[PDB]
């Protein structure tokens, strides 16, 4: 029982760290952005830069697309690597949480065997071992 | 490819070959080695594990030419049976022996006779670390007959699972062709290194030169690591010699 308590307390800590981290992170949108035009000719002559009034490089930035009007001391690479490091740290938290979830699950499966009841082990062709209890109501 | 162009390599090889006929003491010398002076210490502890250098242009030997011994895991019944019956590998080996049988049957002077009889020694990669004690000192100094690791079957291992024991005759034949046709080297923690490049009376001087550039190219190319690209920092000099002849320079920096 104390083992299950200990393993869980670590897992809950890991989850809480992750959700705090993900709030820091920003996630690029990947979704279709359909435009509606009343005329067929407007559809054919449509161009993203003209509709958004932005330079062509600037069109592709979804989060902050700025009209040409608005457009009118740390090294960049080290900044870029540091952004990458933060993403990796949150990802590492997820892996730790998932690993802890599996460990906590199997320990509970062991605890059920300890408790009173009548059980039979069933082994699948793949070799996985599980226990099916008899349909006896608990007094 | 500069070393081939330089006439110094050609002129040295002609002198080396010419001497071998004239001098009685070099009559039994048949192989040509190149001695490489790497600029800095390699840093690789000698593990007695050969590393193969692919010689693309030409082929040093063929499996049929050499007396080949195979040392297999105990029991050797499976490996011996499959190799002997299959047409491709039926005649590929001088003899097939297990490690325990090799230890029991051959001791003392019998090891020396075993060294003379066989020109090439190959072994299952699993038993290789045992061989130094069994074969004795004579095999494991000088590098003439160091056992070569070979993998019997293409099956790979996974942690917490058991290897399935199989024997693939074509794969065993396939690896052995690569060993004999290509040259090989063994790392050591110093400047010096020795690699075989040709055989007297079998390879012409231009053929030997081509092998030398292939050896140098593979050893210097960092893209070929860990097997190649081990000579970092350039080569101060290169020599050519037989087993007992003196080192004749062929390239200096």
């Amino acid at each position: 029982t104390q083992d299950s308590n200990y393993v869980r307390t670590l897992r809950q800590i890991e989850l809480k760290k992750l959700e705090k981290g993900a709030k820091q992170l920003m996630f690029k949108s990947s979704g279709n952005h359909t435009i509606f035009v009343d005329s067929r000719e407007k559809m054919n002559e449509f161009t993203p830069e003209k509709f958004f009034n932005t330079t062509s490089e600037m069109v592709n930035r979804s989060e902050n697309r700025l009209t040409k009007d608005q457009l009118a001391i740390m090294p960049k690479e080290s900044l870029d690597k540091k952004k990458l490091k933060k993403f990796k740290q949150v990802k590492q938290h997820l892996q730790r949480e998932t690993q802890l979830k599996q460990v906590q699950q199997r320990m509970d499966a062991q605890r059920e065997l300890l408790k009173k009841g009548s059980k039979k082990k069933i082994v699948d062709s793949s070799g996985k071992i599980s226990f099916k209890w008899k349909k006896q109501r608990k007094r | 490819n500069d070393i081939i162009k330089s006439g110094l390599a050609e002129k040295a090889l002609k002198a080396l070959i010419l001497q071998c006929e004239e001098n009685p003491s070099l009559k039994n010398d048949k192989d040509i080695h190149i001695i490489i002076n790497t600029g800095k210490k390699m840093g690789i502890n000698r593990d007695n594990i050969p590393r193969i250098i692919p010689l693309t242009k030409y082929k040093l030997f063929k499996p049929r030419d050499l007396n080949i011994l195979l040392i297999t895991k105990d029991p050797s019944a499976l490996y011996r049976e499959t190799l002997t019956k299959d047409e491709h590998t039926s005649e590929l080996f001088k003899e097939i022996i297990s490690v325990k049988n090799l230890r029991r049957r051959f001791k003392g002077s019998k090891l020396t006779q075993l060294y003379k009889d066989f020109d090439l020694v190959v072994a299952d990669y699993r038993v290789h670390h045992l061989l130094p004690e069994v074969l004795g000192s004579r095999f494991y100094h000088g590098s003439k007959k160091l056992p070569y690791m070979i993998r019997m079957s293409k099956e790979v291992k996974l942690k917490r699972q058991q290897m399935v024991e199989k024997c693939d005759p074509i794969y065993v034949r396939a690896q052995l062709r690569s060993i004999c046709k290509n040259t090989s080297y063994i790392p050591n923690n110093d400047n010096c290194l020795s690699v075989r490049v040709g055989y007297i009376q079998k390879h012409s001087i231009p053929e030997i030169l081509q092998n030398i550039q292939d050896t140098i190219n593979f050893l210097t190319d960092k893209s070929k690591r860990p097997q190649g690209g081990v000579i970092k920092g350039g080569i101060i000099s290169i020599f050519v010699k037989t087993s007992n002849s003196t080192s004749l320079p062929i390239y200096q920096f």
């Binding site: 993900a22 996630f27 690029k28 330079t55 490089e57 600037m58 930035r61 040409k68 457009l71 009118a72 960049k76 690479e77 900044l79 870029d80 690597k81 952004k83 990458l84 993403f87 990796k88 949150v90 990802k91 997820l94 | -």
Partner: protein, 45 residues
């Protein structure tokens, strides 16, 4: 009022390059953009 000279239309179009160029440093590099997508999909999933 849309009275731009070509020189007027040029000096501004230099500013467009100037400011857009500045935001490229923040926008981050494409090679890291490639790997950072792989990380995200794992954590989002």
């Amino acid at each position: 009022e849309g009275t731009l000279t070509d020189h007027e239309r040029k000096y501004l179009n230099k500013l467009i390059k100037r400011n857009s160029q500045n935001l490229r440093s923040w926008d981050l590099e494409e090679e890291v953009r490639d790997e950072l997508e792989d990380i995200q999909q794992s954590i989002l999933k």
